[PDB]
Tab-separated table of C-alpha atoms and ligand atoms in Angstrom:
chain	number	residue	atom	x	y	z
A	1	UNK	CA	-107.975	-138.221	153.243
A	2	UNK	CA	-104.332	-137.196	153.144
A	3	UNK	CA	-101.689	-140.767	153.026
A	4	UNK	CA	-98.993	-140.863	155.625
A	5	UNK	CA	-96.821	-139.371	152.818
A	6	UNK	CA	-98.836	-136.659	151.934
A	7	UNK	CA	-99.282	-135.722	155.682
A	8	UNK	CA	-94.954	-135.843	156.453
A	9	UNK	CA	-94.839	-133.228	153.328
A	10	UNK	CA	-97.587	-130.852	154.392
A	11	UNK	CA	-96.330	-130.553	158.118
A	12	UNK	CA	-94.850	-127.156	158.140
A	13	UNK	CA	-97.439	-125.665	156.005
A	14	UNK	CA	-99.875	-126.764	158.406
A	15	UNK	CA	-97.606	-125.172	161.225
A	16	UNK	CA	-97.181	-122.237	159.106
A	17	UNK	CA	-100.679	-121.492	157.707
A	18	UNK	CA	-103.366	-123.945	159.533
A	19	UNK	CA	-102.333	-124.010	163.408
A	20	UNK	CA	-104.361	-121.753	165.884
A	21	UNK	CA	-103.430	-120.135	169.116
A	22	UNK	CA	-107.548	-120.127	169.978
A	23	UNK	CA	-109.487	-117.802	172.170
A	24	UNK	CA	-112.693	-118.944	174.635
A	25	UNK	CA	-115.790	-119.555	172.093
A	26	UNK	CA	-113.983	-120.402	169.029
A	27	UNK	CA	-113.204	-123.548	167.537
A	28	UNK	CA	-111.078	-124.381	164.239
A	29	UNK	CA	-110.897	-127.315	161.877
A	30	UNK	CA	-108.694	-128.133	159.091
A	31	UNK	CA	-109.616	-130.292	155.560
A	32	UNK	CA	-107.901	-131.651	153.128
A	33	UNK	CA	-108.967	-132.700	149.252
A	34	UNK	CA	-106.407	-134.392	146.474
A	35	UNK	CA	-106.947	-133.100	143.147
A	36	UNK	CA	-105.982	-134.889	139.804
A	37	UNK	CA	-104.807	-131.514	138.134
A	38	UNK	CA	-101.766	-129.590	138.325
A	39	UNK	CA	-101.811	-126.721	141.083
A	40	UNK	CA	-101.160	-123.683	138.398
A	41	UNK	CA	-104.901	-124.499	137.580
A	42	UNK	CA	-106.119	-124.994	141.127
A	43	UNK	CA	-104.744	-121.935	142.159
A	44	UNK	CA	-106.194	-119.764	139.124
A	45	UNK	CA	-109.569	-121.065	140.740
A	46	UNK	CA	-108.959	-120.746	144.740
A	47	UNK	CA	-107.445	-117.338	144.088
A	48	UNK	CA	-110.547	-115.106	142.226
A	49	UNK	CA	-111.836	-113.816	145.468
A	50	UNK	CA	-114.426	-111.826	142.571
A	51	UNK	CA	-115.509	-115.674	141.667
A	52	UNK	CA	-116.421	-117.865	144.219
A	53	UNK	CA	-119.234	-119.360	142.421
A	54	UNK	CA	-116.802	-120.829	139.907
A	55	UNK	CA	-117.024	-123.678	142.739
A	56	UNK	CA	-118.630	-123.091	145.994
A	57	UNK	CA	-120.955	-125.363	146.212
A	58	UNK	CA	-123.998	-123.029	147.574
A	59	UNK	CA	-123.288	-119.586	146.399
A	60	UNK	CA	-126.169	-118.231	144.299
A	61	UNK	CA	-123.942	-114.899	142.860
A	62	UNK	CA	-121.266	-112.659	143.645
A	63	UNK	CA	-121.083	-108.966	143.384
A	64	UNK	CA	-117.772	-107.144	143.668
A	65	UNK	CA	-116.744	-103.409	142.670
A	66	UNK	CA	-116.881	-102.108	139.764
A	67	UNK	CA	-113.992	-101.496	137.998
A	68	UNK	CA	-112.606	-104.754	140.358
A	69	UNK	CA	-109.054	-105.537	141.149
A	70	UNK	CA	-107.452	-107.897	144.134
A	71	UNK	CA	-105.978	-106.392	146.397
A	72	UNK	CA	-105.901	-107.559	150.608
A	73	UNK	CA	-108.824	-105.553	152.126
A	74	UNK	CA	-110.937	-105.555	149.243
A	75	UNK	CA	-115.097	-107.190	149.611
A	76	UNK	CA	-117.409	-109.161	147.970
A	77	UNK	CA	-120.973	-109.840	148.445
A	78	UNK	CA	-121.619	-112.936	148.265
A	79	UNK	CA	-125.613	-113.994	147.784
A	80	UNK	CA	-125.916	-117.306	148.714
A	81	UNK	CA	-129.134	-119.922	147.071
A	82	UNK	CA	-132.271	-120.743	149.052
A	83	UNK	CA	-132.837	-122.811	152.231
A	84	UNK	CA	-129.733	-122.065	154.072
A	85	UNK	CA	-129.859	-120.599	157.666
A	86	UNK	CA	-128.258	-117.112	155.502
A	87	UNK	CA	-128.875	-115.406	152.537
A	88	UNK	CA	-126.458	-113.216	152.615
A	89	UNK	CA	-122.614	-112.926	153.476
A	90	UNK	CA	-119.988	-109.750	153.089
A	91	UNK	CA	-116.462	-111.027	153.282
A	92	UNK	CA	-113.088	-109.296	153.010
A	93	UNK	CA	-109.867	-110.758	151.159
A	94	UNK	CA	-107.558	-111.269	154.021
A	95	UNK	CA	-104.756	-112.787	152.370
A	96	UNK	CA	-103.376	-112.975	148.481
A	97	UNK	CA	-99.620	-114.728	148.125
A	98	UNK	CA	-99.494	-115.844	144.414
A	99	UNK	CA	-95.904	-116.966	144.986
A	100	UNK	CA	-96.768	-119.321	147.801
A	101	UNK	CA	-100.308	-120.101	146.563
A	102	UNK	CA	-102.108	-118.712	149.843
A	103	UNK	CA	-105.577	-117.196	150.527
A	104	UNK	CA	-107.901	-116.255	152.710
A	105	UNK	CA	-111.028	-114.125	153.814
A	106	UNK	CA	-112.993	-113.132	156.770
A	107	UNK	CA	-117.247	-112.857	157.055
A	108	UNK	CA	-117.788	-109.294	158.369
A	109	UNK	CA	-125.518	-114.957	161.263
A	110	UNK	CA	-124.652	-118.093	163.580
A	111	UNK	CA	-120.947	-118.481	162.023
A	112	UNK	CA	-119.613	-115.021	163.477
A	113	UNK	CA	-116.348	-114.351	163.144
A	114	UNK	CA	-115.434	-116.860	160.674
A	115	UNK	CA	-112.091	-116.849	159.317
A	116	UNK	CA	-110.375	-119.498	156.613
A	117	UNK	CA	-107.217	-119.800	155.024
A	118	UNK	CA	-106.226	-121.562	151.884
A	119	UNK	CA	-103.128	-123.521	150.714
A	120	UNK	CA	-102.505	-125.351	147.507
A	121	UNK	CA	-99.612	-127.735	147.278
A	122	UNK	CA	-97.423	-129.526	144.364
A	123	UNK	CA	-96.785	-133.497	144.318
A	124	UNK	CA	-95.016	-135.589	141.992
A	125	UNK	CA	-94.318	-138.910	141.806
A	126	UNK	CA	-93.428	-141.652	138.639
A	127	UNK	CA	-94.597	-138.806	136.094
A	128	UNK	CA	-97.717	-138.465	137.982
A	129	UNK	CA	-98.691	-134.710	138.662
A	130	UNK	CA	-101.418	-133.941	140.774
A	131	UNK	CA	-102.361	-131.155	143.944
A	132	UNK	CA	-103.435	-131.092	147.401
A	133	UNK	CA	-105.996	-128.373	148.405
A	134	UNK	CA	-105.236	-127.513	152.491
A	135	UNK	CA	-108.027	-125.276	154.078
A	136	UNK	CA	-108.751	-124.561	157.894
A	137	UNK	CA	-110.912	-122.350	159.583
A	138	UNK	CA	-111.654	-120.112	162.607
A	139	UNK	CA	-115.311	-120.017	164.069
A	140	UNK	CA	-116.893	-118.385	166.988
A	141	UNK	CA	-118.777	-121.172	169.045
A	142	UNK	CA	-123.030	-120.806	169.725
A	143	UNK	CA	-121.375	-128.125	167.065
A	144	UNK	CA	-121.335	-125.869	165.228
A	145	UNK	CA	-118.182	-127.305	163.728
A	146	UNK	CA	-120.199	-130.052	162.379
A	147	UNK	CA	-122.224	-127.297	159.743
A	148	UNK	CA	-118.946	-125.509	158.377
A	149	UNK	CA	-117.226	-128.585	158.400
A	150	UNK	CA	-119.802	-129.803	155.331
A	151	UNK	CA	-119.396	-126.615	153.597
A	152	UNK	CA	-116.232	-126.765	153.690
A	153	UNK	CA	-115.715	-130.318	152.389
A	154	UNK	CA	-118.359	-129.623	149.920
A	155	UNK	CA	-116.498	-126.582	148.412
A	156	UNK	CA	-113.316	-128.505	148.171
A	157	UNK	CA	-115.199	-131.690	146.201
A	158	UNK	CA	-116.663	-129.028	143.872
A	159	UNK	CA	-113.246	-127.567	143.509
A	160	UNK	CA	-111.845	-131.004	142.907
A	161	UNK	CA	-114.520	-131.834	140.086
A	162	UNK	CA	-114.131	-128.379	138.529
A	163	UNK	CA	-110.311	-128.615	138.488
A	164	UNK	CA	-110.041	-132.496	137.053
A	165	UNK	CA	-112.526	-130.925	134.385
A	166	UNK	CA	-110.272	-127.594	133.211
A	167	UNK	CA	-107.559	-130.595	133.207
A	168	UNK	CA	-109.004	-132.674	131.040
B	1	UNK	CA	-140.388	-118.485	150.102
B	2	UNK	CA	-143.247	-119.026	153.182
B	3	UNK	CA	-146.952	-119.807	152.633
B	4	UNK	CA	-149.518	-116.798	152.819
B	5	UNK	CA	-152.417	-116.689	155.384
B	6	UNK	CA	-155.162	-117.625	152.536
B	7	UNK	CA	-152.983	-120.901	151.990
B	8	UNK	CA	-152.404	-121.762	155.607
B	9	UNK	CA	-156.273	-121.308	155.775
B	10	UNK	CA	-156.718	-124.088	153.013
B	11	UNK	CA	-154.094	-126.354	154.217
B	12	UNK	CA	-155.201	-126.808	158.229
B	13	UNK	CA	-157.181	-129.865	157.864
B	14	UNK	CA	-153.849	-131.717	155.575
B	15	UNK	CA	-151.738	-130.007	158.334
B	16	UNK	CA	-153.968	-131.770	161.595
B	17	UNK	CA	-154.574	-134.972	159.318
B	18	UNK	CA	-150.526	-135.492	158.295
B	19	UNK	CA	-148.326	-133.183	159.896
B	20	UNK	CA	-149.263	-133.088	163.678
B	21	UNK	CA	-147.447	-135.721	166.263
B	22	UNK	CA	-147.447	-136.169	169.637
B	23	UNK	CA	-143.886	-136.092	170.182
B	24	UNK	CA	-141.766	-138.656	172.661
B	25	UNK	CA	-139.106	-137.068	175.224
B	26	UNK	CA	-135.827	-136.946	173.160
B	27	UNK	CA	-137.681	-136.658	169.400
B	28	UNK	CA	-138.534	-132.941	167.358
B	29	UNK	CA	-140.781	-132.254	164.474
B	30	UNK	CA	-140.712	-129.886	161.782
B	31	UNK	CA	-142.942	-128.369	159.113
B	32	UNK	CA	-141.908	-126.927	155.933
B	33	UNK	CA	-144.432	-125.271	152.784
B	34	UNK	CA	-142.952	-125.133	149.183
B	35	UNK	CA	-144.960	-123.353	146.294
B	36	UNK	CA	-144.346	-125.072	142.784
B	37	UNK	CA	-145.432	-123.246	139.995
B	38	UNK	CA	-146.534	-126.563	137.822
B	39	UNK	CA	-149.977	-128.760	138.276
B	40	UNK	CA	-149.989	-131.824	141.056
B	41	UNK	CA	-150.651	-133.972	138.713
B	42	UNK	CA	-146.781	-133.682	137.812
B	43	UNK	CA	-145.583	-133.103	141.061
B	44	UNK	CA	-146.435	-136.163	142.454
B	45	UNK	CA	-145.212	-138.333	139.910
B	46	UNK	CA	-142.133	-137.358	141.541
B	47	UNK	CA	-142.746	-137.166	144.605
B	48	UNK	CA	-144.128	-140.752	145.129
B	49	UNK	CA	-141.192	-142.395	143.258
B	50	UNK	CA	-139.736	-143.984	146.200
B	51	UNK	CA	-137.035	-145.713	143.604
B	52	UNK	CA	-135.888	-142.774	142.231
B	53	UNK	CA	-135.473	-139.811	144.731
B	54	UNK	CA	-132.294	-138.469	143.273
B	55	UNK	CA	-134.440	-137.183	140.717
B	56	UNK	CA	-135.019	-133.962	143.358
B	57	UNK	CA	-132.915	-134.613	146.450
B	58	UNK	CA	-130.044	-132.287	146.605
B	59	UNK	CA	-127.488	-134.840	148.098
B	60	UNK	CA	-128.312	-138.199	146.494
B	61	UNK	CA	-125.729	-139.142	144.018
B	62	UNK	CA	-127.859	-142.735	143.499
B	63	UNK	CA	-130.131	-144.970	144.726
B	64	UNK	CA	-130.619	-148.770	144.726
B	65	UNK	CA	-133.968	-150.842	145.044
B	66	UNK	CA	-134.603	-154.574	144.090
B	67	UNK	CA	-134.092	-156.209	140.819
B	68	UNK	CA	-138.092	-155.890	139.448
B	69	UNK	CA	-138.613	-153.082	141.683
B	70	UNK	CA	-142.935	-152.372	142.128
B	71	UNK	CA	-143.740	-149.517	144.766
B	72	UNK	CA	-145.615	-151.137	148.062
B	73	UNK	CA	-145.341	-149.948	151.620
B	74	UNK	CA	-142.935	-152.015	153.409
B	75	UNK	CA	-140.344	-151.574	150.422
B	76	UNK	CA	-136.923	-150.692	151.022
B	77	UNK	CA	-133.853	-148.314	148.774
B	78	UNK	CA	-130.560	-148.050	149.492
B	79	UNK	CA	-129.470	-144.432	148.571
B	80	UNK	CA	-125.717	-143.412	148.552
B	81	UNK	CA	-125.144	-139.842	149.344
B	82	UNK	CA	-122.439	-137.575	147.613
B	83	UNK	CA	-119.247	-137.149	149.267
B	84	UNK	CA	-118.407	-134.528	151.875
B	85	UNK	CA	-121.409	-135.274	154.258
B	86	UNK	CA	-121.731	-136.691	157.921
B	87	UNK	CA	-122.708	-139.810	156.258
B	88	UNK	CA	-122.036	-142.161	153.155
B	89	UNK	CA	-125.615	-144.079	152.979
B	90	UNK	CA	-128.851	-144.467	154.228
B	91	UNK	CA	-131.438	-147.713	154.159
B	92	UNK	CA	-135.106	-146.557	153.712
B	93	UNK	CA	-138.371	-148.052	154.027
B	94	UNK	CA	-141.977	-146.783	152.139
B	95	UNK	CA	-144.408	-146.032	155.198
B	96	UNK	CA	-147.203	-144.455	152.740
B	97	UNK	CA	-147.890	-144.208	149.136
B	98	UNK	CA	-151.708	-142.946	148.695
B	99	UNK	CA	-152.063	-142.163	144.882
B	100	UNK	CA	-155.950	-141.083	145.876
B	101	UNK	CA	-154.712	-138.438	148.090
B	102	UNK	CA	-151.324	-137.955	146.948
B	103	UNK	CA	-149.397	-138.734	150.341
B	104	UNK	CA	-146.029	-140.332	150.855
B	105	UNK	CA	-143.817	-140.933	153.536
B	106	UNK	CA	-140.635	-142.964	154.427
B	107	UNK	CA	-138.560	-144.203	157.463
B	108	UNK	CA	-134.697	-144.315	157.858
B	109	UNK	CA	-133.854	-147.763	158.655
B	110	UNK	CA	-130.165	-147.693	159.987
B	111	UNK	CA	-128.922	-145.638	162.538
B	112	UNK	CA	-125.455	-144.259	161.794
B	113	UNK	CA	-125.681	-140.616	161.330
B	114	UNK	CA	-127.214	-138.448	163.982
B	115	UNK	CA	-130.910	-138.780	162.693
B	116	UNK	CA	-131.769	-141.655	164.441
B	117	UNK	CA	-135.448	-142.582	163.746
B	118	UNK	CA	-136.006	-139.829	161.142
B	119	UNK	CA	-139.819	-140.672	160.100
B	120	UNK	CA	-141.013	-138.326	157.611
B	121	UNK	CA	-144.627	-137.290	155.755
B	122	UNK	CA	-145.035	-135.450	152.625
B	123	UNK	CA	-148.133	-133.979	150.488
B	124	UNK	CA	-149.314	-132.347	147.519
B	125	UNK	CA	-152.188	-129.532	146.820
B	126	UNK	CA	-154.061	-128.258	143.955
B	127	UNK	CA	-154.685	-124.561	144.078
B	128	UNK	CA	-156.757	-122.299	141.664
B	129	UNK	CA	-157.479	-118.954	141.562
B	130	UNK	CA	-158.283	-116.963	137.919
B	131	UNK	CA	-156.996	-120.151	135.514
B	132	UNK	CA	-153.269	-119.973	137.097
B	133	UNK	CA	-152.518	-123.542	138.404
B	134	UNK	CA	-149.933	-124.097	141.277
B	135	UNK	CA	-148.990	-126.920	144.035
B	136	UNK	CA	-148.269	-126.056	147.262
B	137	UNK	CA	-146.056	-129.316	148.841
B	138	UNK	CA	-145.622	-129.905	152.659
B	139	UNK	CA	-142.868	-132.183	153.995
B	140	UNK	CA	-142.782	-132.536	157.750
B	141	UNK	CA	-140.792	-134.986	159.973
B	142	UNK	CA	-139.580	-136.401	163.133
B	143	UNK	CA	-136.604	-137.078	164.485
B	144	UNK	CA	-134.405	-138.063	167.913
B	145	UNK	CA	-132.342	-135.537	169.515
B	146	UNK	CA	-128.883	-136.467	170.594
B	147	UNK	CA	-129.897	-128.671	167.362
B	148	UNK	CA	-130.481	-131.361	164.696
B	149	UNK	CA	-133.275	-129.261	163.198
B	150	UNK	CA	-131.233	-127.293	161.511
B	151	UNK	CA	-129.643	-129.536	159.278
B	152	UNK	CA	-132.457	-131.826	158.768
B	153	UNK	CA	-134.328	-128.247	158.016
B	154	UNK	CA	-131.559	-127.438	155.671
B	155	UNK	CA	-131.599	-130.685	153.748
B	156	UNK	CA	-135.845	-130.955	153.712
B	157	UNK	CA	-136.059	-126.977	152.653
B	158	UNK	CA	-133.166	-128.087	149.890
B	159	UNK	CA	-134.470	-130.993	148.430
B	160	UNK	CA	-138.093	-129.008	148.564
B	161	UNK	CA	-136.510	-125.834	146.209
B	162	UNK	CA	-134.928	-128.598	143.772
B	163	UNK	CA	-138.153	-130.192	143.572
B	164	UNK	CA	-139.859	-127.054	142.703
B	165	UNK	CA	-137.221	-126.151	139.859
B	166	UNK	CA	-137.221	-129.878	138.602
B	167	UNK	CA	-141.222	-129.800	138.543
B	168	UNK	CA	-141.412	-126.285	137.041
B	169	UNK	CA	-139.067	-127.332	134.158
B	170	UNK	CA	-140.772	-130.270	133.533
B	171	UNK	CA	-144.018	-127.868	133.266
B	172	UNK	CA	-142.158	-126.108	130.403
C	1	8V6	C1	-123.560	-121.869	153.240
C	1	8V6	C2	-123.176	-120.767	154.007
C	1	8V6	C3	-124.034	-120.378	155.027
C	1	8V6	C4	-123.805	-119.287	155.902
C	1	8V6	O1	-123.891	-119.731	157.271
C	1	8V6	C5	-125.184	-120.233	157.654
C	1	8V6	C6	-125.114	-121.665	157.526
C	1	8V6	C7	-125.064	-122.793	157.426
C	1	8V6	C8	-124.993	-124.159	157.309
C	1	8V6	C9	-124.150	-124.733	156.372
C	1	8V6	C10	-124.085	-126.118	156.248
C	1	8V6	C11	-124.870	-126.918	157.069
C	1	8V6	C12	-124.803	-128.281	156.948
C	1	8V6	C13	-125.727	-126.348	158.012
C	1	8V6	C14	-125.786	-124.962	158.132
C	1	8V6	C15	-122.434	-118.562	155.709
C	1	8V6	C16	-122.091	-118.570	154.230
C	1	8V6	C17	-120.745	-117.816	154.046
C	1	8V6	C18	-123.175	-117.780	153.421
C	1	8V6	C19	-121.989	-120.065	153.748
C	1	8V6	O2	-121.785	-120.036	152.332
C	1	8V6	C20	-120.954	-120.728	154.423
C	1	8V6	C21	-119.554	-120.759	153.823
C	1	8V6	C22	-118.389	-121.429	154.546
C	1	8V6	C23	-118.643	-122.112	155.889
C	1	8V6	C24	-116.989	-121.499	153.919
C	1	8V6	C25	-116.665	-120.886	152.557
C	1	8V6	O3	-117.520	-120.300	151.864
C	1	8V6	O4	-115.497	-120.954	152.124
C	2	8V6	C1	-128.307	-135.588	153.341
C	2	8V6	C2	-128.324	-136.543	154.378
C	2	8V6	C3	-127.290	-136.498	155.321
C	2	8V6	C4	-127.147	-137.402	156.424
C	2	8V6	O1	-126.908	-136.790	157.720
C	2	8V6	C5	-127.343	-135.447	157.802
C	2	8V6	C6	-127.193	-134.871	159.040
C	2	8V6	C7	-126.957	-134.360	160.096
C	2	8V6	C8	-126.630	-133.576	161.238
C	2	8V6	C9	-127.180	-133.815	162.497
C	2	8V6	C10	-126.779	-133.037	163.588
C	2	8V6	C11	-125.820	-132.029	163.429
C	2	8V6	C12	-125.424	-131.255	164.525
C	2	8V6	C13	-125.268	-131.807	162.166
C	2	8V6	C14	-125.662	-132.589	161.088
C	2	8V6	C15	-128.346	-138.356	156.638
C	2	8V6	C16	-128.909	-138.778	155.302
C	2	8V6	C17	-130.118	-139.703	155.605
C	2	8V6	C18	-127.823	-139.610	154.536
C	2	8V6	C19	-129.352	-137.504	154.457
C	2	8V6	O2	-129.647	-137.943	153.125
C	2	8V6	C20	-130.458	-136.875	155.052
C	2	8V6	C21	-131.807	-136.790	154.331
C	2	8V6	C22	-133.011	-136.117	154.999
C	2	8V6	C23	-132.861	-135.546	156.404
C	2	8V6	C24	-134.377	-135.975	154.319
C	2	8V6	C25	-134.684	-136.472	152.911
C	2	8V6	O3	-133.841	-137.039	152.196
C	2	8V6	O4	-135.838	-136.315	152.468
């Protein structure tokens, strides 16, 4: 969890980016993950909408086009490993700003209309380089709040853990 | 992924002997099958190693028993659970470990998390047909209500499909 700090310098990207103007029957949530690794690398990861994999922490495979290059609009098919309430999820690439560092996608199961975005963010303090990983979501209501929430958290450790190691 | 009908057929008796409560207002049960393509014999030996679960449970970063740790009902580990969960730990306590009939179960000993009084059961099966050898492993438990299911589900059905790859290496 994010230090008072931390929290003062992510403000208006979490007004920018993470804040909801909700409808009835959905719900949002935002989490946050420090990374020891500069964000050039963290960003090389969060951005390959064709690679999830690379460190979601339940994704089985990902099929894309052929021929595939990012652009907004574009899908994957994402298959996802066994004992899951899905198997299955097709989700399109909402948002790409390499300048900013900012992603997103949208599912087109129980989580309907889900909807995330993705930030990454520079800090730098005594010589000390490292990155803060900002992601929130959108979710249509049946807690189930309380099942994306893990995901969620889970993805961002994995990214975390996959980062430090490219760092090395 | 799900047991066939000839199965089923051969399991009802471990099903009505293990796997069947009478349930308490505020508590659910659930039932899940997992074929392992490796002999019991094998599949067991991990299963019943109440000091080492992290050996097949998807979420278990580590787990601590006694100092001269020897299996008996009544024991108790301490597991710590990786990071990004609804909880940090759990304390645990051995309520079976039959070696004759290959059944083991445990209690959750703590109260923290939303599983409150999660009791669980779990048991192993030969099967045989034409010289192929597999094991067929059912895990059932309870658990109080505060849908809980599905994430006790996800975890049991989790843990079950590592335990089948783990087992089936170790088969080589
Ligand atoms: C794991 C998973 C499951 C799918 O939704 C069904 C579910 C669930 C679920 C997840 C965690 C827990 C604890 C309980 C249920 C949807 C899915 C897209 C295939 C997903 O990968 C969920 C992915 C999510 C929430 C975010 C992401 O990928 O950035
Ligand atoms: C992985 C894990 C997570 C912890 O809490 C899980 C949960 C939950 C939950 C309940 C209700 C809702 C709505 C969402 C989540 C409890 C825990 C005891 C530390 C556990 O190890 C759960 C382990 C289980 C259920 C079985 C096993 O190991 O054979």
């Amino acid at each position: 969890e994010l230090t008072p700090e931390e929290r003062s310098e992510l403000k208006n990207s979490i007004a920018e980016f993470h804040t909801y103007q909700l409808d009835p029957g959905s719900c949002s949530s935002l989490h946050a993950q420090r990374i020891h690794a500069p964000p050039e690398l963290v960003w090389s990861i969060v951005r390959r909408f064709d690679k999830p994999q690379t460190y979601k922490h339940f994704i089985k495979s990902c099929s894309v086009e052929q021929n595939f290059e990012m652009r907004v609009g574009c899908t994957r098919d994402v298959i996802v490993i066994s004992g899951l309430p899905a198997n299955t999820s097709t989700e399109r690439l909402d948002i790409l700003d390499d300048e900013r560092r900012v992603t997103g996608f949208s599912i087109i199961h129980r989580l309907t209309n889900y909807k995330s975005v993705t930030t990454v963010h520079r800090f730098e303090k005594e010589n000390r380089i490292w990155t803060v990983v900002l992601e929130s979501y959108v979710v249509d209501m049946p807690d189930t709040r309380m099942f994306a929430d893990t995901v969620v958290k889970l993805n961002l450790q994995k990214l975390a853990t996959v980062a430090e190691a490219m760092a090395r």
